[PDB]
CSV table of C-alpha atoms in Angstrom, one decimal:
chain,number,residue,atom,x,y,z
A,1,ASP,CA,-28.7,-25.6,-14.8
A,2,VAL,CA,-25.1,-24.6,-13.9
A,3,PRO,CA,-24.5,-21.8,-11.4
A,4,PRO,CA,-21.9,-19.2,-12.1
A,5,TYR,CA,-18.3,-19.6,-11.1
A,6,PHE,CA,-15.0,-18.0,-12.0
A,7,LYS,CA,-12.5,-19.9,-14.2
A,8,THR,CA,-9.8,-17.3,-13.6
A,9,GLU,CA,-9.5,-14.5,-11.1
A,10,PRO,CA,-7.7,-11.3,-12.1
A,11,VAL,CA,-4.4,-10.1,-10.6
A,12,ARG,CA,-4.8,-7.9,-7.5
A,13,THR,CA,-2.8,-5.0,-8.7
A,14,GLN,CA,-1.7,-4.0,-12.2
A,15,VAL,CA,0.3,-1.0,-13.6
A,16,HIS,CA,-0.5,0.6,-17.0
A,17,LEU,CA,0.9,3.6,-18.9
A,18,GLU,CA,-1.2,6.6,-19.8
A,19,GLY,CA,-2.4,6.6,-23.4
A,20,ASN,CA,-2.3,2.8,-23.6
A,21,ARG,CA,-5.5,0.8,-23.9
A,22,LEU,CA,-6.9,-1.3,-21.1
A,23,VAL,CA,-8.8,-4.5,-21.3
A,24,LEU,CA,-10.5,-6.1,-18.3
A,25,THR,CA,-12.4,-9.4,-18.5
A,26,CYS,CA,-15.0,-11.2,-16.4
A,27,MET,CA,-13.9,-14.8,-17.0
A,28,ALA,CA,-16.8,-16.9,-15.8
A,29,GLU,CA,-18.8,-20.0,-16.8
A,30,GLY,CA,-22.4,-21.1,-16.1
A,31,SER,CA,-25.8,-21.9,-17.5
A,32,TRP,CA,-27.4,-19.6,-20.1
A,33,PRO,CA,-27.9,-16.8,-19.8
A,34,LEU,CA,-24.6,-15.6,-18.5
A,35,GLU,CA,-24.7,-11.8,-18.0
A,36,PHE,CA,-21.9,-9.4,-16.8
A,37,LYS,CA,-21.8,-5.9,-15.3
A,38,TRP,CA,-18.9,-3.7,-14.2
A,39,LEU,CA,-18.1,-1.7,-11.1
A,40,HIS,CA,-15.6,1.1,-10.7
A,41,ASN,CA,-15.0,1.9,-7.0
A,42,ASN,CA,-18.1,0.0,-6.2
A,43,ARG,CA,-20.2,2.2,-8.6
A,44,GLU,CA,-22.1,0.9,-11.6
A,45,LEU,CA,-20.1,1.3,-14.8
A,46,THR,CA,-22.4,-0.9,-16.9
A,47,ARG,CA,-25.7,-2.7,-16.5
A,48,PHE,CA,-25.9,-6.4,-17.1
A,49,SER,CA,-25.3,-7.5,-20.7
A,50,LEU,CA,-23.6,-10.2,-22.8
A,51,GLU,CA,-20.3,-8.2,-22.8
A,52,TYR,CA,-17.7,-9.7,-20.5
A,53,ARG,CA,-15.1,-7.1,-21.4
A,54,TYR,CA,-14.6,-3.6,-20.1
A,55,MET,CA,-12.3,-1.6,-22.3
A,56,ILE,CA,-10.7,1.8,-22.1
A,57,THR,CA,-9.2,2.8,-25.5
A,58,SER,CA,-6.9,5.4,-24.0
A,59,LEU,CA,-6.0,5.4,-20.3
A,60,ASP,CA,-5.9,8.6,-18.2
A,61,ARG,CA,-4.5,8.9,-14.7
A,62,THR,CA,-8.1,9.7,-13.7
A,63,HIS,CA,-8.9,6.1,-14.6
A,64,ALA,CA,-6.8,4.9,-11.7
A,65,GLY,CA,-8.7,3.0,-9.0
A,66,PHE,CA,-10.6,-0.2,-8.3
A,67,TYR,CA,-12.5,-2.3,-10.9
A,68,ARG,CA,-14.5,-5.5,-10.5
A,69,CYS,CA,-17.1,-7.6,-12.3
A,70,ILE,CA,-20.5,-9.1,-11.3
A,71,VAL,CA,-21.6,-12.2,-13.2
A,72,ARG,CA,-25.1,-13.6,-13.0
A,73,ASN,CA,-27.6,-16.1,-14.4
A,74,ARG,CA,-31.1,-17.3,-13.5
A,75,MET,CA,-29.5,-19.2,-10.6
A,76,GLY,CA,-27.6,-16.4,-8.9
A,77,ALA,CA,-24.8,-13.8,-9.0
A,78,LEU,CA,-21.1,-13.7,-8.1
A,79,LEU,CA,-18.9,-10.7,-7.2
A,80,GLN,CA,-15.5,-10.9,-8.9
A,81,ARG,CA,-12.2,-10.3,-7.0
A,82,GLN,CA,-11.5,-6.6,-7.0
A,83,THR,CA,-8.4,-5.3,-8.9
A,84,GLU,CA,-6.6,-2.0,-8.7
A,85,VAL,CA,-5.7,-0.3,-12.0
A,86,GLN,CA,-2.7,1.9,-11.4
A,87,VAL,CA,-2.0,4.4,-14.1
A,88,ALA,CA,1.7,5.3,-14.5
A,89,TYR,CA,2.2,9.1,-14.9
A,90,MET,CA,4.2,12.1,-13.9
A,91,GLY,CA,3.4,15.8,-13.5
A,92,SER,CA,5.7,18.8,-13.1
A,93,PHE,CA,7.4,20.7,-10.3
A,94,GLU,CA,4.9,23.5,-9.9
A,95,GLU,CA,6.8,25.0,-7.0
A,96,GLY,CA,8.8,28.2,-7.7
A,97,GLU,CA,12.4,29.0,-6.6
A,98,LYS,CA,13.0,28.8,-2.8
A,99,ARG,CA,15.7,29.9,-0.5
A,100,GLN,CA,16.8,28.8,3.0
A,101,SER,CA,19.4,29.9,5.5
A,102,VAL,CA,21.4,28.2,8.2
A,103,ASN,CA,24.3,28.9,10.5
A,104,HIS,CA,27.6,27.0,10.2
A,105,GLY,CA,27.5,23.8,12.3
A,106,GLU,CA,23.7,23.6,12.1
A,107,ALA,CA,22.2,20.8,10.0
A,108,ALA,CA,20.6,22.0,6.7
A,109,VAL,CA,17.3,20.3,6.0
A,110,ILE,CA,16.1,20.7,2.4
A,111,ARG,CA,12.9,18.9,1.5
A,112,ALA,CA,12.4,17.6,-2.1
A,113,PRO,CA,10.2,19.9,-4.1
A,114,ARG,CA,6.7,18.4,-4.7
A,115,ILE,CA,5.8,16.4,-7.7
A,116,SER,CA,2.8,14.1,-8.3
A,117,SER,CA,3.7,10.8,-9.9
A,118,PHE,CA,2.9,7.1,-10.0
A,119,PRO,CA,5.0,5.3,-9.2
A,120,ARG,CA,6.9,7.5,-6.8
A,121,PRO,CA,9.9,8.9,-8.8
A,122,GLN,CA,13.6,8.2,-8.2
A,123,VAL,CA,15.0,11.5,-6.9
A,124,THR,CA,18.6,12.7,-7.3
A,125,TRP,CA,20.1,15.8,-5.6
A,126,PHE,CA,22.1,18.3,-7.6
A,127,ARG,CA,24.1,21.5,-7.2
A,128,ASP,CA,25.8,23.2,-10.2
A,129,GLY,CA,25.1,20.3,-12.5
A,130,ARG,CA,26.9,18.0,-10.1
A,131,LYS,CA,25.2,15.0,-8.4
A,132,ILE,CA,25.2,15.0,-4.6
A,133,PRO,CA,25.8,11.5,-3.3
A,134,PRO,CA,25.1,10.5,0.4
A,135,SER,CA,28.2,10.9,2.5
A,136,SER,CA,29.2,10.8,6.1
A,137,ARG,CA,28.3,14.5,6.1
A,138,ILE,CA,25.4,14.3,3.7
A,139,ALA,CA,22.3,12.3,4.1
A,140,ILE,CA,19.4,11.7,1.6
A,141,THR,CA,16.4,10.3,3.4
A,142,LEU,CA,13.7,7.8,2.2
A,143,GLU,CA,11.5,10.9,1.6
A,144,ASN,CA,14.3,12.3,-0.6
A,145,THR,CA,15.0,15.1,1.9
A,146,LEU,CA,18.6,16.4,1.7
A,147,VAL,CA,20.3,16.8,5.1
A,148,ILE,CA,23.7,18.5,5.3
A,149,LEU,CA,25.4,17.8,8.7
A,150,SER,CA,27.6,20.5,10.4
A,151,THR,CA,27.3,22.8,7.5
A,152,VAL,CA,30.3,24.9,6.4
A,153,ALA,CA,30.3,28.1,4.3
A,154,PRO,CA,31.1,26.3,1.0
A,155,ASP,CA,27.8,24.4,1.4
A,156,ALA,CA,25.9,27.5,0.3
A,157,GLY,CA,24.4,27.5,-3.1
A,158,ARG,CA,21.6,26.5,-5.5
A,159,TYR,CA,20.4,22.9,-4.9
A,160,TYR,CA,17.8,21.1,-7.0
A,161,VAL,CA,16.5,17.7,-7.9
A,162,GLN,CA,16.0,15.5,-10.9
A,163,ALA,CA,13.2,13.0,-10.8
A,164,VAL,CA,12.7,9.9,-13.0
A,165,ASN,CA,9.6,7.8,-13.2
A,166,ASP,CA,10.8,4.1,-13.4
A,167,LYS,CA,7.8,2.8,-15.5
A,168,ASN,CA,7.2,5.5,-18.1
A,169,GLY,CA,10.8,6.8,-18.1
A,170,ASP,CA,9.8,10.5,-17.6
A,171,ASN,CA,12.5,12.9,-16.4
A,172,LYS,CA,11.8,16.2,-14.8
A,173,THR,CA,14.1,18.9,-13.3
A,174,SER,CA,12.9,21.1,-10.4
A,175,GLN,CA,13.3,24.8,-9.5
A,176,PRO,CA,16.3,25.4,-7.2
A,177,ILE,CA,16.5,26.1,-3.5
A,178,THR,CA,19.2,28.5,-2.5
A,179,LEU,CA,20.9,27.7,0.8
A,180,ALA,CA,22.8,30.5,2.6
A,181,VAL,CA,25.3,29.7,5.3
A,182,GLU,CA,26.0,32.4,7.9
A,183,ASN,CA,29.1,33.0,10.1
A,184,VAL,CA,28.1,34.0,13.7
A,185,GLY,CA,30.5,33.0,16.4
A,186,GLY,CA,33.5,30.7,16.2
A,187,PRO,CA,33.2,27.5,14.0
A,188,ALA,CA,34.8,25.3,16.7
A,189,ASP,CA,32.0,25.1,19.2
A,190,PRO,CA,31.0,21.6,20.1
A,191,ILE,CA,27.4,20.3,19.5
A,192,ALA,CA,25.6,17.6,21.4
A,193,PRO,CA,23.9,14.8,19.3
A,194,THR,CA,20.7,15.7,17.7
A,195,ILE,CA,18.1,13.7,15.7
A,196,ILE,CA,17.2,15.5,12.5
A,197,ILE,CA,15.2,12.6,11.0
A,198,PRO,CA,13.5,10.3,13.5
A,199,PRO,CA,12.2,6.8,12.6
A,200,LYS,CA,8.7,6.7,11.2
A,201,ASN,CA,5.8,4.3,11.9
A,202,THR,CA,6.2,1.8,9.1
A,203,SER,CA,4.0,-1.1,7.8
A,204,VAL,CA,4.9,-3.9,5.3
A,205,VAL,CA,3.3,-7.0,3.9
A,206,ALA,CA,5.3,-10.1,4.8
A,207,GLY,CA,5.5,-11.0,1.1
A,208,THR,CA,8.0,-8.2,0.4
A,209,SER,CA,11.7,-8.3,0.1
A,210,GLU,CA,12.9,-5.4,2.2
A,211,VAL,CA,11.8,-2.8,4.7
A,212,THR,CA,13.9,0.0,6.0
A,213,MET,CA,13.8,2.2,9.2
A,214,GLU,CA,15.8,5.4,9.0
A,215,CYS,CA,17.4,7.8,11.5
A,216,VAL,CA,19.7,10.8,10.8
A,217,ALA,CA,21.8,12.4,13.5
A,218,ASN,CA,23.9,15.6,13.6
A,219,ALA,CA,26.8,16.4,15.9
A,220,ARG,CA,30.1,18.3,16.2
A,221,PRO,CA,32.7,17.0,15.6
A,222,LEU,CA,30.8,14.6,13.3
A,223,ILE,CA,33.5,12.0,13.6
A,224,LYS,CA,32.6,10.9,17.1
A,225,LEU,CA,28.9,10.7,16.3
A,226,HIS,CA,27.7,7.2,16.8
A,227,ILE,CA,24.2,5.8,16.1
A,228,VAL,CA,22.9,2.6,17.7
A,229,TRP,CA,19.8,0.7,16.6
A,230,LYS,CA,17.5,-1.2,19.0
A,231,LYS,CA,14.5,-3.5,18.8
A,232,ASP,CA,12.2,-3.7,21.8
A,233,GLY,CA,15.1,-2.5,23.9
A,234,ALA,CA,17.8,-4.8,22.5
A,235,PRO,CA,20.8,-3.7,20.4
A,236,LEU,CA,21.0,-4.8,16.7
A,237,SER,CA,24.3,-5.8,15.0
A,238,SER,CA,23.3,-6.5,11.4
A,239,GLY,CA,21.3,-4.9,8.6
A,240,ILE,CA,22.8,-1.6,9.4
A,241,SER,CA,24.0,0.6,6.6
A,242,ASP,CA,24.4,4.1,5.4
A,243,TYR,CA,26.4,5.6,8.1
A,244,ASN,CA,24.3,3.9,10.6
A,245,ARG,CA,21.4,5.9,9.4
A,246,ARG,CA,19.5,3.0,7.8
A,247,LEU,CA,18.3,-0.3,9.3
A,248,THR,CA,17.3,-2.8,6.6
A,249,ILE,CA,15.3,-5.9,7.3
A,250,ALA,CA,15.3,-8.5,4.5
A,251,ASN,CA,12.1,-10.7,3.8
A,252,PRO,CA,10.3,-9.4,7.0
A,253,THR,CA,8.2,-11.8,9.0
A,254,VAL,CA,5.5,-11.3,11.7
A,255,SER,CA,8.3,-11.8,14.2
A,256,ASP,CA,10.3,-8.8,12.8
A,257,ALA,CA,7.5,-6.5,13.8
A,258,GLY,CA,8.1,-4.4,16.9
A,259,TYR,CA,9.5,-1.2,18.4
A,260,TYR,CA,12.6,0.1,16.7
A,261,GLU,CA,14.8,2.8,18.4
A,262,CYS,CA,17.6,5.1,17.2
A,263,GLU,CA,20.1,6.3,19.7
A,264,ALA,CA,22.6,9.1,18.9
A,265,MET,CA,25.6,9.6,21.2
A,266,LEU,CA,29.2,10.8,21.3
A,267,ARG,CA,31.9,8.1,21.4
A,268,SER,CA,33.6,7.9,24.8
A,269,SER,CA,31.4,10.6,26.2
A,270,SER,CA,29.6,11.8,29.3
A,271,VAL,CA,26.1,12.3,28.1
A,272,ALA,CA,22.8,10.5,28.0
A,273,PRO,CA,22.2,9.7,24.3
A,274,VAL,CA,19.2,11.0,22.5
A,275,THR,CA,16.6,8.5,21.5
A,276,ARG,CA,13.7,8.3,18.9
A,277,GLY,CA,11.5,5.4,18.3
A,278,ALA,CA,8.9,4.0,15.9
A,279,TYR,CA,6.8,0.8,15.3
A,280,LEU,CA,7.2,-1.6,12.4
A,281,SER,CA,4.0,-3.5,11.6
A,282,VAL,CA,4.2,-6.6,9.5
A,283,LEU,CA,1.0,-8.0,7.9
A,284,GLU,CA,-0.2,-11.3,6.4
A,285,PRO,CA,-2.9,-11.3,3.7
A,286,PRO,CA,-6.1,-13.2,4.5
A,287,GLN,CA,-6.1,-16.9,3.8
A,288,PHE,CA,-8.9,-19.5,4.4
A,289,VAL,CA,-8.5,-22.4,6.8
A,290,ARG,CA,-12.1,-23.4,6.4
A,291,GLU,CA,-14.1,-23.1,3.2
A,292,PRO,CA,-17.7,-24.1,2.7
A,293,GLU,CA,-18.4,-26.7,0.1
A,294,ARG,CA,-18.9,-25.4,-3.4
A,295,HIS,CA,-22.4,-26.8,-3.4
A,296,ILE,CA,-24.8,-26.8,-0.5
A,297,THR,CA,-28.4,-28.1,-0.1
A,298,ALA,CA,-30.6,-27.4,3.0
A,299,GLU,CA,-34.3,-27.8,3.5
A,300,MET,CA,-37.2,-25.4,4.5
A,301,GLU,CA,-37.6,-24.6,7.2
A,302,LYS,CA,-34.6,-25.9,9.1
A,303,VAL,CA,-31.5,-23.9,9.9
A,304,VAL,CA,-28.3,-24.2,7.9
A,305,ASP,CA,-24.7,-23.3,8.7
A,306,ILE,CA,-22.0,-22.3,6.2
A,307,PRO,CA,-18.5,-22.5,7.7
A,308,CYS,CA,-15.9,-19.8,6.8
A,309,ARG,CA,-12.8,-19.0,8.8
A,310,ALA,CA,-9.7,-17.1,7.7
A,311,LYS,CA,-6.1,-16.6,8.9
A,312,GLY,CA,-4.2,-13.3,8.7
A,313,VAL,CA,-2.6,-10.4,10.4
A,314,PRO,CA,-4.6,-8.6,11.8
A,315,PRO,CA,-7.4,-11.2,12.2
A,316,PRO,CA,-9.4,-10.7,9.0
A,317,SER,CA,-13.1,-9.6,9.0
A,318,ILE,CA,-15.6,-12.0,7.5
A,319,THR,CA,-18.3,-10.5,5.3
A,320,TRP,CA,-21.2,-12.3,3.5
A,321,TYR,CA,-22.9,-11.6,0.2
A,322,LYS,CA,-25.9,-13.2,-1.5
A,323,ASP,CA,-26.1,-12.8,-5.2
A,324,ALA,CA,-23.6,-9.9,-5.1
A,325,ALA,CA,-25.5,-8.1,-2.4
A,326,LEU,CA,-24.3,-7.6,1.2
A,327,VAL,CA,-26.2,-10.0,3.4
A,328,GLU,CA,-28.2,-8.3,6.1
A,329,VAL,CA,-27.0,-9.8,9.4
A,330,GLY,CA,-28.5,-8.8,12.7
A,331,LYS,CA,-31.0,-9.8,15.4
A,332,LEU,CA,-34.1,-8.7,13.5
A,333,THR,CA,-33.1,-11.0,10.7
A,334,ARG,CA,-33.1,-14.6,9.9
A,335,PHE,CA,-29.4,-14.3,9.1
A,336,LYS,CA,-26.8,-14.3,11.9
A,337,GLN,CA,-23.1,-14.4,11.9
A,338,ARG,CA,-21.1,-16.4,14.5
A,339,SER,CA,-18.0,-14.6,15.9
A,340,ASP,CA,-16.5,-17.8,14.7
A,341,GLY,CA,-17.0,-16.4,11.2
A,342,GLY,CA,-19.6,-18.8,9.8
A,343,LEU,CA,-23.1,-17.9,8.7
A,344,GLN,CA,-26.3,-19.3,10.1
A,345,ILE,CA,-29.6,-19.0,8.2
A,346,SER,CA,-32.9,-19.7,10.0
A,347,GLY,CA,-36.4,-20.3,8.7
A,348,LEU,CA,-35.2,-21.2,5.2
A,349,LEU,CA,-37.4,-19.4,2.6
A,350,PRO,CA,-37.3,-20.8,-0.9
A,351,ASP,CA,-35.8,-17.4,-1.9
A,352,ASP,CA,-32.7,-18.2,0.2
A,353,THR,CA,-31.7,-20.2,-2.9
A,354,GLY,CA,-28.7,-18.7,-4.7
A,355,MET,CA,-25.0,-17.9,-4.6
A,356,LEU,CA,-23.4,-17.0,-1.3
A,357,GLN,CA,-20.0,-15.4,-1.1
A,358,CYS,CA,-17.6,-15.2,1.9
A,359,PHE,CA,-15.1,-12.4,1.8
A,360,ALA,CA,-12.1,-12.3,4.2
A,361,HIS,CA,-10.7,-8.8,4.3
A,362,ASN,CA,-7.9,-7.0,6.0
A,363,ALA,CA,-5.6,-4.0,5.3
A,364,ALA,CA,-3.2,-6.2,3.4
A,365,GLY,CA,-5.6,-8.2,1.2
A,366,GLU,CA,-8.9,-9.9,0.3
A,367,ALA,CA,-9.9,-13.5,-0.2
A,368,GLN,CA,-13.2,-14.9,-1.4
A,369,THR,CA,-15.1,-18.2,-1.8
A,370,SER,CA,-18.5,-19.0,-3.1
A,371,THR,CA,-21.2,-21.7,-2.5
A,372,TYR,CA,-24.5,-22.5,-4.2
A,373,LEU,CA,-27.2,-22.8,-1.5
A,374,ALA,CA,-30.2,-24.7,-2.7
A,375,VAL,CA,-33.4,-24.9,-0.7
A,376,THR,CA,-35.5,-28.1,-0.7
A,377,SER,CA,-38.0,-30.0,1.4
């Protein structure tokens, strides 16, 4: 009479190549009989059986998504930790040839032609078979948009991209975009600082290595263009790269979160700078500070309390299951959940016997614990 439990929980995320085979396992132990069923995006994929494996002989990108297992025996049922199968692939540049036009001095903004791919491909800008590296006059954004500051006539031509998927090695070339540069009025006219690419609202899990805010500015003459970064109003003096276009935070913490501003101005000038801002949110995955005991016995018809509190950013939501089924909490029920997080059961029916599972969820993760509740008296 052993209730189910998991010997090993699967990894949260995993990347596979298209065409390769895929084996998932429900590694559990318990007392005969131990049955297993599989869920794909919370929809039944199998019914209960003796088969603990779910196998896909040949992966497709359409197989990407969430999988999990349910294990059960005559004493109860457990919901396995959910995993995300990510299928590495790369489509083609379906877009045709394009053409844009700009006047000299104006910034030329050329978005990277669309392509669907996992992971996101590495993109490199080209023109006449020559690579186009970022310069003081040429920016390539995080979105792989090509910006050409204070364009001159020789900037006109056919630009295109090459895209390489890092995990399957695929290499595609896009159709070209033809930039025309016009000549209206003298090319010596001054231009006040402009922000072509403002910072974007950006979120990162604290268990990452880097996070980058970006801001691209245009001016004439480009040489006296200066970009200052700020956090919550205060200037920053490190982590700045590109030509002051990129602000890179290493190993971000919850403290690094906040409002980041980009200010473009002319050196030794007369003018109010132009400012654009965006928030950086830093999250922590859920993590228990209070777990119920892995075996619990209460008696009919008293009330029992099962403690469960989690820690994380933002404050994680606590959700209860009984035998892999969402517990019905509410005032017309015997079950009620403290804002504390714990679960209180009143009027213990013999059928309240089984496996209870506490799930702590937030946008950056999911944690889970189980207990065996046995009714006596």
